[PDB]
Design a protein around this nucleic acid. Structure first.
Ligand SMILES: [Mg+2]
Ligand SMILES: [Mg+2]
Ligand SMILES: [Mg+2]
Ligand SMILES: [Mg+2]
Ligand SMILES: [Mg+2]
Ligand SMILES: [Mg+2]
Ligand SMILES: [Mg+2]
Ligand SMILES: [Mg+2]
Ligand SMILES: [Mg+2]
Ligand SMILES: [Mg+2]
Ligand SMILES: [Mg+2]
Ligand SMILES: [Mg+2]
Ligand SMILES: [Mg+2]
Ligand SMILES: [Mg+2]
Ligand SMILES: [Mg+2]
Ligand SMILES: [Mg+2]
Ligand SMILES: [Mg+2]
Ligand SMILES: [Mg+2]
Ligand SMILES: [Mg+2]
Ligand SMILES: [Mg+2]
Ligand SMILES: [Mg+2]
Ligand SMILES: [Mg+2]
Ligand SMILES: [Mg+2]
Lengths: 99, 152, 127, 208, 83, 100
RNA sequence: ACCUUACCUGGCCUUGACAUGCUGAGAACUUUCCAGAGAUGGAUUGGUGCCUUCGGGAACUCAGACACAGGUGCUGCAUGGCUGUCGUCAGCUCGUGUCGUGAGAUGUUGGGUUAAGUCCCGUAACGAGCGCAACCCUUGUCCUUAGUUACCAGCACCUCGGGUGGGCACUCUAAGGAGACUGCCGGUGACAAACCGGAGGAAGGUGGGGAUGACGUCAAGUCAUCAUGGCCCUUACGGCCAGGGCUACACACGUGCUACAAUGGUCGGUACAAAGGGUUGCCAAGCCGCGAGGUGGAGCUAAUCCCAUAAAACCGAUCGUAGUCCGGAUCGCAGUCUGCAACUCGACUGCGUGAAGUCGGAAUCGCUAGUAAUCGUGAAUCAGAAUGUCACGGUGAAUACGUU
């Protein structure tokens, strides 16, 4: 019984990673419960765009953090531990607990 | 506007009395978005009217309103060379709002204990027409009559 | 048994359960009167039920989260309307004409740059 | 009026970030600063090589850099000892091991940055702007490139009054978002000051 | 005001220049640039020339104004008058 | 945003980072109630004699690219305006223009 | 407040705070000391270091000479880049053809209709481009996927707390999708575009909001964010340090906050939100203080722990319109917190005094529906310092005959 957490700025890559890990874990016979989308974290910034005095001209920018949760039952094969380069490629962070 | 496309949202939210005119009086008397305060004030004035007049306060309020509703009013017009005022009859809908506005405005400045007995006194006065609101309505009417030479 | 409904209005949500009974009417495990204190919430809540003359025939058990008191009352009204029309699917036109099934869509407009409120602006002296 | 940045407004919709990785408050600033310094250093050193796009991918405690250029033999020279000396140079900007991939790009005259740099370097050699801009538009339009717009602003020629000129061909719809407008800017430091060059290239409608 | 965990506050150089001035009595005004110094009750009777910004203004200290800072008695803005 | 300004604020950074513990020790001594005036006054003198340019209040963080004091976002290391350039170029990861 | 900082006073440096080229000597470190407001200078235990073709080299500290380094110095009327504005108004043009000796004009005019150069039909014009609309984000309805730290319909345990077993029901979270397209009906209309009502529908006529700003104009703003052609200083117009000023004050102007009270001021208990920040951080419990606060340390790398108890609203008691149980400036005394240091020049706390202020002339401003009005909450900058900025919810109006 282990728990896996996934963090990413973009949702497409986190979805691809979740599908990949689900497929790898299911294909070996170990049971897996469905992913949990944790609430995203949105941070916003309002910035001046003029080099000098124009207070009303401003830009709004946003950074989004997406989190997914997975859990397994009946751990029998552990190959994804050696598949870290497969699981994470450029912009997805993976945490594992209760190994 | 220039389109004449604006709708007319209908609000009728009388809690227990189930009266339409009472609801618009609520909307008129409400201040700063305080609906509950308006409810308490109007209902206290209504209860004072009941405990004073043996007649039911519904018809007393109605007959006070119908004795303060004007028929014609004077409106300025730019003739292009002079300052003229022409009398025009009231739209059937507008007179109710005019009566409500006049009643609440004159009730706001009595100087007695609270607006409960203020509105009570105004309703009793305008039931037969001894209130200042009726006097100012008559003054507006006599403006309109003294400016009848234009009429049109 | 029972029937279920959901009502939302102005970031307020409410789950309603309509069962046979004598109308205990529990709001968040509390009585209806003990929740709304001296306001127009009671009758606006019971409006769909009193329109169908079925005030007591249906015991109502609800839970409401979010928003304010008026928003909660509107959410309960919508939810119990949905629960009712999940029992009496011939009065659909009745509550269309009553105007109780259409969900409210107005929401708090956001703030914009250069303005204080959603639409208020500073004074703009001409000089 | 002022136009929004065509590449900025298309980020996430059809464009992609050049620096793709993940971090947190501990080292977000460190990683971002390292990326900007490494991009500046790469461009400044191999400015002679026609480099267009530098992508940064940061897995756990490593950095994989892919370079887009039109002249791969300049960096891959005699089995690319240039690659190894470049790695040694880069090792200090970011402490993680570095990994360099050289990517070849077809049709260098359909790339906004390469076209802008070519126009600027022609301008630096006292070539009058109209012929350069016309030939750039001609080359771009001759192969695909459903639209191109080239703008040059500054003290054109040597007159002491700046002005702006621009030539367009095809269609360049900037307000639409399905389009993928490649956009680039560059500068030329002549004897009279700076002359700015902007290039927009419209390639097609992204459907699906 | 300063928290009571630190009653006085005098620069070390000022202390060592005036702690000498207690064994031997007041004989010479002390030229000081520290306006943050807190005058303790056991230096009453000395003349201190505090830096105004252009010159040092000399002041004498007695027990009445012991609970005050040095520069508080040395103003920096002239304001001779509008008219 | 002169060269000298950047160099001399790097000086503050270096001096503050170089001690980084003696301030903590002396403030622990001072803040602790049961420390006695005997062990408080010597700590006061130690704090006073130590150089003034080794304090957090003496540090003004500027842009790492130009050194602009105003308009700083500590989420990044950038100033008010180079953030816009980097974002538009696409160098800042995960950053897009927001409407909501 | 120091710094920031660019100004003043004073003190101190000339290859210099920084980079490259030359030569020479050596570890930076740590030496816990003295003179001075301080830059700075002088003694200063200890180790000479790493790899060697073992010759020397790297990098570090210092010294000397030039080529220099340096400037928030001037020119925005020499410039790039970036921005305001007309204006989110519906306009602005080109190719070929045609008309005119020409500058030019047609297309782009007409009759309708639309928010729209949007669309229809006519028509020496036929086409095209930048604009409008659409593609993007958010909200409003429903389906599937999934149930942890989230939820609790049903069973049970129950110390009556989703507290536990458990559930995939619901809400909720976030991904993928359906839905609204004038689709259907009646009337009008050149039987065209389109217009006025109706059904269904959660939503009906670009549903609501945001991003998106055409050709150009104002020699509009910026050389002080940055870059940059010139011109300018080299013992200073470049550097270092300590104090003072930008927070001064006979007056005038712009933008807000608090009020002038009874749709209220206090007192007691009581109800419901959204959004967000946190490991050089949040910082709970108990306990100690009237208080601002202090010891203490749990838990949290965060749907879990903290910031942190929303207020206005409702009820009950009181005040009775009095410059007042209104209003809070000013002022006196003593405190608390961070910071090396709250005098010039911080914010809050306790006691007391308690002002102008009775809704405000000429003139003038914002707003068409979750809007105006009113009540609270969070973030950034930041050791501390918001009545400012950005953002989030609670309650919740009146009015539009019409275009002179
Ligand atoms: Mg919102
Ligand atoms: Mg609001
Ligand atoms: Mg004005
Ligand atoms: Mg510079
Ligand atoms: Mg600071
Ligand atoms: Mg200074
Ligand atoms: Mg200009
Ligand atoms: Mg300019
Ligand atoms: Mg001709
Ligand atoms: Mg003509
Ligand atoms: Mg014409
Ligand atoms: Mg004409
Ligand atoms: Mg023509
Ligand atoms: Mg023509
Ligand atoms: Mg035209
Ligand atoms: Mg024409
Ligand atoms: Mg068009
Ligand atoms: Mg559009
Ligand atoms: Mg804009
Ligand atoms: Mg000018
Ligand atoms: Mg100017
Ligand atoms: Mg100032
Ligand atoms: Mg409008």
């Amino acid at each position: 019984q282990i728990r896996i957490r996934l963090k990413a700025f973009d949702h497409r890559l986190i979805d691809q990673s979740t599908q990949e890990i689900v497929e790898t874990a299911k294909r070996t016979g170990a049971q897996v419960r469905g992913p949990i989308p944790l609430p995203t974290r949105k941070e916003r910034f309002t910035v001046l765009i003029s080099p000098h005095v124009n207070k009303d001209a401003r830009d709004q920018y946003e950074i989004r953090t997406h989190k997914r949760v997975l859990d397994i039952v009946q751990p029998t094969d552990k190959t994804v531990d050696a598949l870290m380069k497969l699981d994470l490629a450029a912009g997805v962070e993976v945490q594992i607990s209760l190994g | 506007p220039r389109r004449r496309v604006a709708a007319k949202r209908e609000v009728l939210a009388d809690p227990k009395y189930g009266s339409q005119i009472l609801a618009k009086f609520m909307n008129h008397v409400m201040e700063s978005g305080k609906k509950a305060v308006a409810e308490r004030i109007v209902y206290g004035a209504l209860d004072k009217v009941k405990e004073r007049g043996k007649a039911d306060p519904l018809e007393t309020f109605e007959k006070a309103l119908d004795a303060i509703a004007p028929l014609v009013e004077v409106k300025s017009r730019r003739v292009g060379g002079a300052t003229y005022q022409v009398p025009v009859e009231v739209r059937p809908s507008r007179r109710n709002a005019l009566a409500m506005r006049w009643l609440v405005d004159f009730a706001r400045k009595r100087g007695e204990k609270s607006m409960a007995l203020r509105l009570a006194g105004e309703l009793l006065d305008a039931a037969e027409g001894k209130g200042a609101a009726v006097k100012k309505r008559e003054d507006v009417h006599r403006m309109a009559e003294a400016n009848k030479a234009f009429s049109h | 048994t029972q029937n279920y409904g959901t009502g939302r209005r102005k970031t307020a949500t409410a789950r309603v359960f309509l069962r046979p009974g004598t109308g205990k009417i529990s709001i968040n495990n509390r009585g209806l009167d003990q929740f709304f204190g001296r306001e127009t919430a009671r009758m606006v809540v019971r409006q769909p039920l009193e329109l169908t003359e079925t005030v007591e025939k249906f015991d109502i058990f609800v839970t409401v989260v979010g928003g304010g008191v008026s928003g909660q009352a509107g959410a309960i009204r919508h939810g119990i309307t949905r629960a009712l029309i999940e029992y009496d699917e011939t009065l659909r036109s009745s509550l269309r004409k009553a105007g109780y099934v259409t969900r409210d869509a107005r929401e708090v407009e956001r703030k914009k740059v250069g303005l204080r409120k959603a639409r208020k602006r500073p004074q703009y002296s001409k000089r | 009026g002022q136009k929004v940045h065509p590449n900025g407004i298309r980020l996430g919709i059809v464009k992609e970030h050049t620096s793709v990785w993940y971090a947190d408050r501990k080292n977000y600033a460190d990683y971002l600063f390292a990326d900007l310094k490494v991009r500046e250093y790469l461009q400044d050193k191999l400015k002679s090589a026609s480099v267009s796009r530098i992508d940064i991918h940061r897995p756990a405690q490593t950095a994989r850099i892919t370079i887009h250029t039109a002249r791969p033999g300049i960096v891959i020279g005699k089995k690319g000892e240039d690659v190894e000396k470049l790695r040694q140079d880069l090792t200090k900007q970011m402490g993680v091991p570095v990994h360099i991939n050289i990517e070849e790009i077809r049709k260098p005259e359909l790339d906004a940055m390469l076209v802008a740099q070519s126009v600027a370097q022609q301008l630096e050699r006292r070539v009058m702007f109209r012929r350069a801009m016309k030939r750039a538009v001609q080359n771009a339009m001759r192969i695909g490139a459903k639209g191109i717009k080239i703008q040059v602003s500054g003290r054109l020629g040597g007159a002491e009054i700046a002005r702006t000129e621009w030539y367009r061909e095809g269609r360049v719809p900037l307000h639409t978002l399905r389009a993928d407008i490649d956009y680039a800017t560059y500068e030329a430091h002549t004897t009279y000051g700076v002359i700015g060059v902007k290039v927009w290239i419209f390639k097609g409608e992204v459907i699906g | 005001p300063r928290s009571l965990k630190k009653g006085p506050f005098i620069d070390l150089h000022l202390l060592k220049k005036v702690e000498v001035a207690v064994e031997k009595n007041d004989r010479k005004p002390i030229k000081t640039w520290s306006r943050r110094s807190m005058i303790l009750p056991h230096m009453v009777g000395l003349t201190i020339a505090v830096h105004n910004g252009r010159q040092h203004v000399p002041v004498l200290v007695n027990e009445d104004m012991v609970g005050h800072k040095l520069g508080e008695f040395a103003a920096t803005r002239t304001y001779r008058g509008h008219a | 945003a002169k060269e000298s300004m950047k160099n001399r604020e790097l000086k503050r950074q270096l001096t503050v980072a170089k001690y980084a513990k003696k301030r903590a020790e002396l403030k622990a001594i001072i803040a602790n109630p049961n420390s006695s005036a005997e062990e408080r006054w010597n700590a006061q003198v130690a704090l006073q004699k130590q150089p003034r340019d080794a304090s957090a209040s003496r540090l003004r963080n500027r842009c790492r690219l130009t050194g602009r004091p105003h308009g700083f976002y500590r989420k990044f290391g950038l100033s008010r305006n180079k953030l816009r350039e980097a974002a538009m170029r696409g160098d800042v990861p995960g950053l897009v223009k927001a409407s909501w």
